[PDB]
């Protein structure tokens, strides 16, 4: 009959994938106040005074809005 043996993938999913193909870890929007695949991704400011600021850019037809939600914790 003989016992059968298992060769197991291992690795690939040892360690999470590295971040940047083109996805930016930090966005600076000082500006004295055209990017690809950051659409639909959650962005945030550092928490301040028990308030979260969550943000994302979404597309409606050919228009893009960056929405910010200020939300107590």
């Amino acid at each position: 009959g003989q016992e059968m043996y298992a060769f197991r993938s291992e690795e690939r999913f040892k360690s999470p994938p590295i971040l940047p193909p083109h996805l930016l870890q930090v966005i600076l929007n000082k500006d004295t106040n055209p990017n690809h695949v950051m659409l639909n991704h959650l962005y945030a400011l550092s928490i301040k005074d028990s308030v979260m600021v969550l943000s994302a850019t979404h597309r409606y037809k050919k228009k893009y809005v960056t929405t910010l939600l200020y939300k107590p914790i």
Binding site: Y60, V65, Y70, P72
Partner: protein
């Protein structure tokens, strides 16, 4: 003139057509402290923010400079009587404090609705901020204003098979307000100015000298500047001193005469990117105001 190139253009364009390729939108949860919310407006360089009720899971209203004005006036009078509730109010709690039985539900417009419908809704509801909300998503896409609408009209009608009414004066068309003009003087304290805003429901006050000549303009826009300060105690200062906090060279107040054509007024307003002109006589004495509201109301009821 009548039936208008304007009326037809407005009926044949969707609200979507005026949304910029890219914009930002600030939304507040109604549990947010009022004080933090108004500071966020300044921070983000934004008038108007839709309000989201998390329990109800819906947009319930807008937060504007007017709301800030109502709150400060209330705060200022309450403090003199040692009541300090207001500035620890959440958006929710202030809303129930004034939206009592008095019901003002959120007014919005679909991206697929006509620009005519937008203009009518703004006028009918006596409002300056019309959120464009996608019915399929429930997402607010943009907040539509009179300024944006007029600019769009100026630009995309800018051909002229021209209505006869465009060559007629504000005088003959009777566009503008020419009585009971709410104004202040150089020395008028900010809290007095607040009271006037609260009573008259008016977006700006001409600042006049001893002879009633206009020398400056105190807008509600200039009022959220106070949300940047940490004390709110500087409401006793004059309108003049409060206006020092402006960004830019203040070239002067943008004026017009009663005898200028609607065309010239529309052109000046769109290029200046301001909400109103102060109507003035030969000698700078204020005779009235012509606002973006006045113009859009005229264009929708067919010019003048």
């Amino acid at each position: 003139s009548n039936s208008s190139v304007y009326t037809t253009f407005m009926k044949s364009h969707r609200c979507y057509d005026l949304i910029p390729t890219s914009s930002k939108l600030v939304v507040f949860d109604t549990s947010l402290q009022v004080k933090k919310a108004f500071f966020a407006l300044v921070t983000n360089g934004v008038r108007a923010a839709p309000l989201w009720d998390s329990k109800k899971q819906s947009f319930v209203g807008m937060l504007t400079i007017t709301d800030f004005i109502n709150i400060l006036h209330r705060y200022y009078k309450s403090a003199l009587v040692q009541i300090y509730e207001l500035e620890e109010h959440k958006i929710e709690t202030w809303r129930e404090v004034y939206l009592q039985d008095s019901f003002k539900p959120l007014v919005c417009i679909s991206p697929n609705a006509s620009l005519f419908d937008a203009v009518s809704s703004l006028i009918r509801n006596k409002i300056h901020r019309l959120p464009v909300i996608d019915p399929e998503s429930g997402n607010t896409l943009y907040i539509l204003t009179h300024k944006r609408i007029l600019k769009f009209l100026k630009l995309f009608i800018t051909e002229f098979p021209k209505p006869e009414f465009m060559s007629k004066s504000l005088e003959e068309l009777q566009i503008g307000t020419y009585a009971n003009i709410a104004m202040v003087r150089t020395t008028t304290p900010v809290y007095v100015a607040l009271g006037i805003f609260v009573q008259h429901r008016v977006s700006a006050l001409p600042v006049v000298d001893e002879k009633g000549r206009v020398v400056d303009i105190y807008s509600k826009f200039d009022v959220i500047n106070l949300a940047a300060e940490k004390t709110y105690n500087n409401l006793d200062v004059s309108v003049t001193k409060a206006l020092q906090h402006r960004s830019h060279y203040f070239e002067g107040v943008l004026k017009c005469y009663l005898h200028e054509t609607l065309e010239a007024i529309i052109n000046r307003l769109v290029e200046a990117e301001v909400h109103r002109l102060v109507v003035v006589d030969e000698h700078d004495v204020v005779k009235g105001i012509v606002s973006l509201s006045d113009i859009l109301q005229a264009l929708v009821l067919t010019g003048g």
